[PDB]
Amino acid sequence: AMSLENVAFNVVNKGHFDGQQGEVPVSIINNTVYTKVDGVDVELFENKTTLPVNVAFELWAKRNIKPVPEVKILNNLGVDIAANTVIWDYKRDAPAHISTIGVCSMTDIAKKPTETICAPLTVFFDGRVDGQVDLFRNARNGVLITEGSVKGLQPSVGPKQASLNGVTLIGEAVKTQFNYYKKVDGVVQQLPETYFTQSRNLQEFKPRSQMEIDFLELAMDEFIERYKLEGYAFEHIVYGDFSHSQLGGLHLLIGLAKRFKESPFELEDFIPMDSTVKNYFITDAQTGSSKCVCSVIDLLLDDFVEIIKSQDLSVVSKVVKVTIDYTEISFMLWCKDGHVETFYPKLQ
Amino acid sequence: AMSLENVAFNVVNKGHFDGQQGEVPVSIINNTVYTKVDGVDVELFENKTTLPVNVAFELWAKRNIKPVPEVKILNNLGVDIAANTVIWDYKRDAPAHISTIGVCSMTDIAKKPTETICAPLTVFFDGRVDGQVDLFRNARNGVLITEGSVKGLQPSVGPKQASLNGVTLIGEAVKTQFNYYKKVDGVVQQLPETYFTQSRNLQEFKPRSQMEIDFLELAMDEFIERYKLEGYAFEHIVYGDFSHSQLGGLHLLIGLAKRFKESPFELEDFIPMDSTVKNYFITDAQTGSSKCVCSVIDLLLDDFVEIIKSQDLSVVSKVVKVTIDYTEISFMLWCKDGHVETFYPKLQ
Amino acid sequence: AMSLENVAFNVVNKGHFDGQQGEVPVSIINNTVYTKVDGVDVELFENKTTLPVNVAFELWAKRNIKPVPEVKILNNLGVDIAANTVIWDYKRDAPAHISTIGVCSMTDIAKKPTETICAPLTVFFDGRVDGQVDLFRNARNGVLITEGSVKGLQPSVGPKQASLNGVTLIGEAVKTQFNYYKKVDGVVQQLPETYFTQSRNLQEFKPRSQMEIDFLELAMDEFIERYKLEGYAFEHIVYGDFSHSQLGGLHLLIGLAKRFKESPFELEDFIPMDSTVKNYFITDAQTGSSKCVCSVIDLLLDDFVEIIKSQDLSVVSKVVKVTIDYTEISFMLWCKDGHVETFYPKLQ
Amino acid sequence: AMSLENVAFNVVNKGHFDGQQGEVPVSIINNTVYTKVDGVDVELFENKTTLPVNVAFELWAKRNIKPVPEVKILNNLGVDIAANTVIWDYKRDAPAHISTIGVCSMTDIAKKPTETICAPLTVFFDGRVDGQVDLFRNARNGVLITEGSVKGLQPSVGPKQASLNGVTLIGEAVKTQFNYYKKVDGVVQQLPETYFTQSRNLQEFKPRSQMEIDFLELAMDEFIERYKLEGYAFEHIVYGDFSHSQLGGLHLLIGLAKRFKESPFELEDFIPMDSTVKNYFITDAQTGSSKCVCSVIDLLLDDFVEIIKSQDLSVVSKVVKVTIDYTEISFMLWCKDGHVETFYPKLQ
Amino acid sequence: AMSLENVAFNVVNKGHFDGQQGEVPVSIINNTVYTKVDGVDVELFENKTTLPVNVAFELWAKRNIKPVPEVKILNNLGVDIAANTVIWDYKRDAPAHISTIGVCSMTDIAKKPTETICAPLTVFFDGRVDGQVDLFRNARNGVLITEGSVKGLQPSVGPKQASLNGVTLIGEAVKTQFNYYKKVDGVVQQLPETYFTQSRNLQEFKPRSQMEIDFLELAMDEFIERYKLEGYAFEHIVYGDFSHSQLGGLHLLIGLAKRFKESPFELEDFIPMDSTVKNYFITDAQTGSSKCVCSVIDLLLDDFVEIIKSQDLSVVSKVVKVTIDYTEISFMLWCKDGHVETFYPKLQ
Numbered sequence A, B, C, D, E: 001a002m003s004l005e006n007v008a009f010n011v012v013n014k015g016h017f018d019g020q021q022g023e024v025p026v027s028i029i030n031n032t033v034y035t036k037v038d039g040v041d042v043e044l045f046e047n048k049t050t051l052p053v054n055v056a057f058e059l060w061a062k063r064n065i066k067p068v069p070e071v072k073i074l075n076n077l078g079v080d081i082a083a084n085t086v087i088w089d090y091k092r093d094a095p096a097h098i099s100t101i102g103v104c105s106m107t108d109i110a111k112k113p114t115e116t117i118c119a120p121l122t123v124f125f126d127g128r129v130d131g132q133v134d135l136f137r138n139a140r141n142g143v144l145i146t147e148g149s150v151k152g153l154q155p156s157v158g159p160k161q162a163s164l165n166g167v168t169l170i171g172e173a174v175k176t177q178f179n180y181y182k183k184v185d186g187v188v189q190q191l192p193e194t195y196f197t198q199s200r201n202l203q204e205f206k207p208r209s210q211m212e213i214d215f216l217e218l219a220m221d222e223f224i225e226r227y228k229l230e231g232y233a234f235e236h237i238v239y240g241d242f243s244h245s246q247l248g249g250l251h252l253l254i255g256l257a258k259r260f261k262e263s264p265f266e267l268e269d270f271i272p273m274d275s276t277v278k279n280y281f282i283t284d285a286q287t288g289s290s291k292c293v294c295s296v297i298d299l300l301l302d303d304f305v306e307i308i309k310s311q312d313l314s315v316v317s318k319v320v321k322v323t324i325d326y327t328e329i330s331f332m333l334w335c336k337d338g339h340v341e342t343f344y345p346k347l348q
């Protein structure tokens, strides 16, 4: 028996929806859900979504609390809907998907993914739940994650990191690295080779390789010498050029991280969502150098070096395409006399 | 298991809350409650109250659907709260009372009126419900209505009319005339002798005596002859004086009713609530005569004639106290040379 | 170049969206759309829907302004979505359908109904628009209306009336009677033989046969004689029984219409939507007789007489299925000793 | 000491703001102002404006409650702001003007109209208020109304009607016909000779000449004979052509009034504001004839007859400028072979 | 003379309500109070409460700005209402109590606590205000704080810390340690022996004893050896077990504080209010260990040790009750073979 008051009961007593019976008094004012605790109202939930406040409250309560793929991964794989769960998008404070399957009466399109209305949609299946590797088998379109091998299917090994209650982390007490599988029109796909973004914070940035350690601890000239990077324009692309009104380059998160230790800057996240490439309007506080659209990606520096060192440097400009987080990321590569001028995620 | 979706279920299938089991999907957006019917949202309730939308919805659904006293009566008797029901105020689209007893977990101050929190409050009891005469006897403060005699309790015969789902009516297939009883500080009170207002509309006004049919079809001069009203200023008080910019008199609803059939006028109900005396800012459309605060009362003309003729006409001005709807209504009486100049419900 | 200000321009200059170029300044505050006219804001639209205010505004502006089927018809035929138009539901002040095709960039699931996302949806097609008969033929699921014959397609003659800008009417300068066609899973379906509800108002009800003029001017006993209705309980079913607290019968709109001319009553439309059978919580103002769920249908009395006389009167109770507005309407038939006790649209 | 609670006090006790001292408790929730009356909240004001709720409340309370020009007049004269009063626009439920002078601390641009910020604005002055004729003389831009002669100032006799608390009326106990005066750039302007619209309702329309009683009771053919209107196309312009899907003509309010008594129609007021010419999207309920933009004007039929007969009928099409309500109203005149085809307020 | 504008004047000029005369212009839009400073609007207050925005604005303005008991203390002592002040709940951004006494017209139940409507309520009295120790004397139910002894009453010495404008602190320039007294039904109570929570921040945590210094600076094994804590399971209860999917133990704030220095984690405060035991849904960023309901209490480690060392360790599981902040806190104690397995504030 689904009810606003029982959803609130679960939130209050179990920290999320947990199928427990019970009711607490609830009041809804504008976009906020309150409950009464000893005669005073206590806020349980502020609706930041475009859904009705009580609907969004229920979907948030029923969010998946196990490590799940980051939304950018799901989006890049074309996932339209999840099977019997809600992937909560913590970057948008909203459900990652419009509709649900067997979750909520206001948003459900079906109780089970085997219903035909689900056949065209790419359904997310979680092999850690009994019976869902088998539902993927009968599913026309879908994406499946597992922790171990699936007899009859070659896996695509995903990123090391997953999202646990909006914290992106590499699990040590839980597994966050999944096998990925995908089916389009009943056919198991071969997922492409792909790099993975590292999903790190500017504030909490930690190197994950000796080259990244070398990048953070060495001066610019030393690092470029040690990894034989003359002519690839890391001065511009990675370190950043702060001498002109328009900030130069600075497209790799580790380069922002290094700069942030020395002097601060504003990153305006004008499309706040999870995505492989992030666009920021950045203002450098020390110099006043700024750029309206500064595309930023968090690649392992190692991976970025391999990408730029695997390009032909003999044309003035061209589009370079790189599979990242399973999607095709277009870069612009600009060269002159056989050296790199700039190289950036294309602003398209 | 009380819930928003169960309240909405009852509204959809039963027209109001009826204790039935069931749920329907509900979405709340701003102050409106919707439910899904074949994929589209249908409005069930627009919150016009100062309570949270889902709370007001529940109280409205749980409104008393039997004939009940008009809110003006309950207010005049000092009613603060109702025992195990909601008196819906259809003139304010809101509960007549702030709190409940045994109705709603958000507004309940108690489950039963015997709880000591209810002792200082004047609780409304309905003798048509098993056990509530006894609860009145045990209550420190209360008002009781019954359809018949309560042994030992001296009754007060109430108005003929009651409110059935916002419709004020004199019952024929149902009983609307109750005995009234009141207790203050554990002690039953004598209810005063009283007139009752008739609760008629301006649009569909109907006379209720030979005098009132006479007033509506006789011209002003022949009516005043026949009922020997010379010197009592019904020309001003009842018929209304539209010759000056300030509209004169016009304090009896029947007088407004006579005028309305001839030429229309505007009545701004600037304090929209049920009360024994109503105040309107009135604008005569024919003449442009107007008055910011025109107090209007709907007495049977008979009763008004009795009241005014009862009066000493030998003082210039004096307050005249008349008991109407159990409350004491002050009138201003202005005389000169043994005749009435004006007589109107005193503006406070 | 589609835009809010261009939609508002069309509304101001053309009365609705008309493809014209232009812009007017618009301000949006809460659910209201305003435009500046000589320095002051003028309301263009109040959002009563569950869509965002500017989206609802655009859909309303793009509403079909030709005669279209009443929403109850489209619902009864399973219509999910309209091809390249908006059917505005004037009884809900909202779009009849959640999504659009080729109307609005926020609600479009497709630009053209041939897109595969539309295949499982029953698409409404309008043969008066070039190319939409062909799109119906190619659609997996659909409902089509036409003004004339479609070669090979067996037609169903629809109701005489259609909705023109929220006004239900039988056209004289325009055609409102359409042929109807329906496809399920690629296969054209036989539409059933059916009665049609008459879609009349209680206030401005007008008879449409000699029987109906007879009902309105004959007294109850002489009408029942003349049409040999003894034992069929029109005293209860149609005329209504106001003698007890629960209002008896009164399930034909014409019966409500007869009563209304005598004495008024309240009809709470607690599920305000277009449907073949309406449910009202009704309160008779004269008697106080009332009923929480009074199902009402507007059949031509002729048709209702035909239906009830068609029935076997030899069982105590049974469900009786009648096709009305293309949907199957269950009635409860209660008999005793070969005469009718009651007969009413079954409450579900 | 100006305050929200003092404004509310005046509304409760005086029907509007009246300078009285006092306070009542007020609660504001969304756009609604409430006050406490015996423990329950009573709505005083619903904000329909684009101003903050408490500001709109104060301006509404301080509305001019004397007869004032209709907003269409003030707009046609270029009035931007009022001197020390609020002209409430009852057709928009909003102030007629954005800013105030000496009314409200949130909307005041000045305390007195002599302040230089007011010089470029056309200030409305009311000669019935001490000192405002003089303020008009000193104002750079202004419009003045008076009840009598102003020495030296050549008057313009205004319409018979004015607006008293939203009621448009020709005064009998009050004066509603004013002299009008206007100043632009310090220089008094000649106001033009002008017709005036009659400002009548469709529902309660009343004729105001022998011609207009003739139009309402004569059939179309005998009226057109008697007033020798052959060849002037009142069949189209005034009576209206309901035979085709596009409703023909019907541009005089009296013509709509004649039709309305026969059969109803819908008038969507899609730009709801006071103006000399109104535009309606009209749907004839009887025929289904409709028109997206039907311009309607309420001229005395006499005046309209005078206007159309004044015209040269020897050109196919031409713009015809007529001064109405002081503004210049363009008509389209379409002729053929020396007779009128159509004549309508030109859509801009 | 109370007014919205004078409340705003005090906020602008005195930083809070201070009884000063004056007015500033105010606009209220949705839940926000603005004032005009040189022609632009400046936000004064965003309503986060369930009260009307202007009411909450006034109660916030009139908040107590002296050190006051933390709300958890007041709640645990059953305080229903404060005498002539507002205890602002900074954890809920709301009044700590529904109603007021002599503070605000919309929420006052009385001007003085001696009124009889206050007799059943437990009223908070502040001995630092003239006359309130005496009002407590005549009060039926109440709680009283003082800075010094009260002749005739044995005190309960409260916590060292109090709340000054939402900052919990141990006063050095002001006294924050109060004497507590309580009366139920006219009888001065003996307040129980009690521990006190320390009310510290995870970010700003400072030790308040040598044992707490030892806990933060020593490694786990050393600390447990030094204070002879083998067998009491501080490894689990205090330090936390981060090796399993479900985070183990971690119920004492100092243990969270120690962990936060090394590596960060998310504490989701899903019931944001002041209370003796806090429930968090915690996600450890380093490991991915998490727990839906992790009850946390900030006891002086010393105090926690004394509690756990004063329990019988010879039953598998039982409820341990400890008076903390004057309320009864139930703990669950789990043992095996005479040693502690876990010990946590009971999730009930």
Ligand SMILES: O=C(NCCN1CCCC1=O)Nc1ccccc1
Binding pocket: A133, A136, A137, A138, A139, A140, A150, A151, A152, A153, A183, A185, A186, A187, A188
């Ligand atoms: O699903 C799988 N093959 C697609 C099966 N088909 C045939 C055509 C329609 C359809 O769905 N294979 C699979 C096997 C083990 C584990 C998970 C998946």
Ligand SMILES: O=C(NCCN1CCCC1=O)Nc1ccccc1
Binding pocket: E133, E136, E137, E138, E139, E140, E150, E151, E152, E153, E183, E185, E186, E187, E188
């Ligand atoms: O209040 C006090 N005793 C309760 C007095 N009673 C008797 C029964 C009713 C009632 O209230 N005592 C007290 C003395 C000094 C300072 C503060 C308090």
